[PDB]
């Protein structure tokens, strides 16, 4: 039975995502906040994709970094071929969905990855932050408030469900996100923002002493 | 065994079309009306194909969107190679049938999709709307009044059979279609028309407050 074999494939990918760390992304007053539990200083799970589009992932590092690179490639080829303001978080999310579906059905092993693509409005513009979650099969879900990826997602998702507040400042959203993530110091956290107030490139890492002050 | 593979492929595709939301397309005074049950705001199941040719689908999103893209490609290459008024809904339907006859017998997994190609007459012209339905096997059916795709088609088809009225206005056909579909607000409906009165591009979405007024 291929269908029963597919249940095994789904379990293998799910096992890989659980065998890992947890990432959260949530909307706050100035844009979107990514907070991941990351011990290494070189290996990163949060990345700029395009001017206003950010990216977080959880699973097997080589594979979600493969997707990271593919997405960067895509976004820049579009931006150059048409224009920068034409690349949207929605296109990117859709490409990742098509690609993870094709991988999930055609390759030997499914990508044990979980993706979150985030987008904010342009400078001086007004629009709500958009969060999309793409799962290993190709499924894509539109999230209004926050995404939790990798590990045990239930306790973190519930703690966020109680603590979340729209239009929370950067410090409050950081406290909420670290607290719900615990359900860790600057030496074990990867924190970045999609600051809607920046003129062009919205992605901005918060590390070291500045991160120390914020938390 | 050719017979067992045919009866196995057939019952999996069908377990995917009935494992999805429902779409209806029906003829009314101003052309053809597509009404689909669609929760997402980014993912769409109704699309323009060419000037007077529309397209609706039900199944696996990545695959019927693959077909959506292929059909767009085809129609534009013909329209440019010959002329716009040479591309007809009939050619498109036929290409989709050949493609769903080749995918079903040659690829690993049949496409679990149900297609409906619609066509109306040109501007200032007179001719009856044509609806074609392409099944995952590669069969094509000529429909005189309405097509129902995906999910539990039989209860919805039974209601349309009682409520259908030729030359119903846009509001009446919308009420009939939503009613028979129930057998949902503007936040869970995808509604578009092939308005025969438009000069060139007949496809036109009905969303937001205008949709609110119509229903």
């Amino acid at each position: 039975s291929p269908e029963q074999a597919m249940r095994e494939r789904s379990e293998l990918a799910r096992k890989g995502i659980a065998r890992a760390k947890s990432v959260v992304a949530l909307a706050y007053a100035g844009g979107v906040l990514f907070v991941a539990e990351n011990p290494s200083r070189s290996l990163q799970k949060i990345s700029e994709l395009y001017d206003r589009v950010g990216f977080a992932a959880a699973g097997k590092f080589n594979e979600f970094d493969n997707l990271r690179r593919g997405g960067i490639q895509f976004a820049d080829t579009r931006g150059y071929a048409y224009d920068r303001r034409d690349v949207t978080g929605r296109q990117l999310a859709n490409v990742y969905a098509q690609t993870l579906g094709t991988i999930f059905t055609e390759q030997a092993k499914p990508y044990e990855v979980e993706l979150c693509v985030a987008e904010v409005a342009h400078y001086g513009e007004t629009k709500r932050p958009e969060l999309y979650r793409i799962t290993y099969d190709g499924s894509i879900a539109d999230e209004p408030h926050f995404v939790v990826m990798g590990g045990t997602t239930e306790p973190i998702a519930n703690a966020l469900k109680e603590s979340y507040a729209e239009n929370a400042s950067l410090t409050d959203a950081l406290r909420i996100a670290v607290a719900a993530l615990r359900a860790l110091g600057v030496a074990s956290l990867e924190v970045a923002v999609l600051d809607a107030n920046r003129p062009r490139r919205a992605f901005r890492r918060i590390t070291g002493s500045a991160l120390q002050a914020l938390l | 065994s050719p017979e067992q593979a045919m009866r196995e492929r057939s019952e999996l595709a069908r377990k995917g079309i009935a494992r999805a939301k429902s779409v209806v397309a029906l003829a009314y005074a101003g052309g053809v009306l597509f009404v689909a049950e669609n929760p997402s705001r980014s993912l769409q199941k109704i699309s323009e194909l060419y000037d007077r040719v529309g397209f609706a689908a039900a199944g696996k999103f990545n695959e019927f969107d693959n077909l959506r893209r292929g059909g767009i490609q085809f129609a534009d290459t013909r329209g440019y190679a010959y002329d716009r008024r040479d591309v007809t809904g009939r050619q498109l339907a036929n290409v989709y049938a050949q493609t769903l006859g080749t995918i079903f017998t040659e690829q690993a997994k049949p496409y679990e999709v149900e297609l409906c190609v619609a066509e109306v007459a040109h501007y200032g012209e007179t001719k009856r709307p044509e609806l074609y339905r392409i099944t995952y096997d590669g069969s094509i059916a000529d429909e005189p009044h309405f097509v129902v795709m995906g999910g539990t088609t039989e209860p919805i088809a039974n209601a349309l059979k009682e409520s259908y009225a030729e030359n119903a206005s846009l509001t009446d056909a919308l009420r009939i279609a939503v009613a028979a579909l129930r057998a949902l607000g503007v936040a869970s409906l995808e509604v578009a028309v092939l308005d025969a009165n438009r000069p060139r591009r007949a496809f036109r979405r009905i969303t937001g407050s205008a949709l609110q007024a119509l229903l």
Binding site: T135 | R19, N38, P155
Partner: protein, 326 residues
């Protein structure tokens, strides 16, 4: 067995009764006609119809009727799955022993009916032995071989060849009218009735019983939220709902009657007021359907055929009440 099952005992089976009469009693009045014509009356009746219901009861009735005509009666009942002795030809020996006992009984001038049940479980095999024994017993026209099978398709057509088992009779489910008949057979007029329900019929016990039977049959044969017993899926995926009208059986109706009597006794010993109420019938129906959800429906094995043969089309999935799909 005691020939206690008369024609009045079985209801909704009048056409079946007449077909059985034509198959069995007719040659007896025309035996001289067959003898003059050098003929062989058919002694093979295959009763194929619904599952656990009253299919075997018709065999008990023809035995009683044959006892009536010659006015001492033997009915040799064999179950089919238990007859199987898979190891090495033991089943063939058992079939020979059964037919030897049938011959011994036929030596006495008492009609004997050899009945086999659940013959769809079985059928180079035991089939030639069974055919040989049937041919051997063909000389004994008094002995009547009656076989039952709920799956006529699985039965090997060799036994269906012309000759031995020529007469095939189909059986049906209890119809609303048949349900009212069977309910009347257990819910007789001698059962106690509630005074409040008597107030609605000015003390006419028979009319009250008839109205109560009509009410309970109508409620059980209705399309309501209380009849969500089975949910059926398909390759086309048109998920539908079966109701308590479908899969109805006499034996289950008798169980409903037994549970209703138990509930009435409980109500008498608790509240104190004697009588029967429609609430007892409804509670018995609910409890007995809850119990009957177990026996035929484990829903993975053998249920697909058990519903498809009766409905008329193969059903991919039955239930009891990748990704990127749009």
């Amino acid at each position: 067995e005691v020939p206690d099952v008369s024609y009045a005992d079985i209801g909704g089976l009048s056409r079946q009764i007449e077909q059985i009469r034509d198959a069995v009693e007719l040659p007896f009045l025309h035996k001289e006609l067959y003898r003059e014509y050098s003929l062989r009356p058919p002694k093979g009746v295959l009763l194929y119809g619904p599952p656990g219901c009253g299919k075997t009861l018709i065999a008990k009735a023809v035995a009683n009727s044959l006892a009536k005509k010659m006015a001492k009666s033997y009915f040799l009942n064999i179950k089919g799955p238990e007859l199987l002795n898979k190891f090495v030809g033991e089943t063939e020996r058992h079939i020979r022993l059964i037919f030897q006992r049938a011959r011994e009984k036929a030596s006495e001038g008492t009609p004997v009916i050899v009945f086999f049940d659940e013959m769809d479980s079985i059928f180079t095999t035991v089939v030639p032995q069974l055919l040989s024994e049937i041919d051997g017993v063909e000389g004994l026209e008094n002995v009547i071989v009656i076989g039952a099978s709920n799956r006529e398709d699985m039965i090997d057509p060799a036994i269906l060849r012309p000759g031995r088992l020529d007469v095939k009779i189909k059986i049906e489910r209890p119809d609303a009218e048949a349900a009212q008949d069977i309910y009347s057979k257990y819910l007789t007029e001698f059962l106690p009735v509630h005074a409040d329900d008597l107030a609605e019929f000015d003390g006419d016990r028979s009319a009250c019983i008839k109205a109560m039977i009509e009410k309970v049959v109508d409620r059980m044969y209705a399309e309501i939220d209380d009849n969500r017993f089975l949910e059926v899926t398909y390759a086309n995926g048109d998920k539908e709902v079966m109701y308590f009208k479908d899969f109805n059986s006499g034996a289950m109706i008798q169980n409903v009657v037994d549970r209703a009597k138990k509930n009435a006794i409980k109500s008498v010993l608790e509240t104190g007021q004697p009588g029967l109420r429609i609430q007892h019938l409804l509670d018995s129906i609910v409890d007995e359907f809850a119990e009957n959800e177990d026996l035929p429906n484990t829903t993975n094995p053998d249920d697909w055929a058990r519903i498809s043969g009766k409905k008329g089309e193969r059903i991919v999935y039955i239930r009891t009440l990748l990704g990127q799909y749009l």
